[PDB]
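The passage that follows is intended for readers who have already worked through the single-chain material. We present the inputs for a multi-component assembly, then the predicted structure in tokenized form, and finally a short commentary. You are encouraged to pause after the input and sketch how you expect the pieces to fit together before reading on.
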Amino acid sequence: AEGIDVTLPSTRVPAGARHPIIMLAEHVADTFIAMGWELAEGPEVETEQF
Amino acid sequence: AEGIDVTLPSTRVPAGARHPIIMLAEHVADTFIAMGWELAEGPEVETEQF
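Having made your guess, compare it with the prediction:
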């Protein structure tokens, strides 16, 4: 007796996901960090001088 | 209209934590991987030859 349905849904938290483009950028970054490189940043609104 | 108490507890999931020793190993591994090194493994029960 005391038998339960072990296949009943147990996830009360909705499905979440990071964007694949962010995931690809994350994997690309990890590849270059593992080779000794670093991550630089820059503003989106740029001067014409640069 | 009456406002709510914005400081009421909202975290219904208990507090979790990774072990500090595991996190220190993660930071140590990240430090050497950022220099080009890699991570090698080995069983804990070893032969006396090795």
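Commentary: Chain A touches chain B through four residues (CB under 8 Å). Residues 5 and 11 of chain A are 15 Å apart (CA to CA). How closely did your sketch match?
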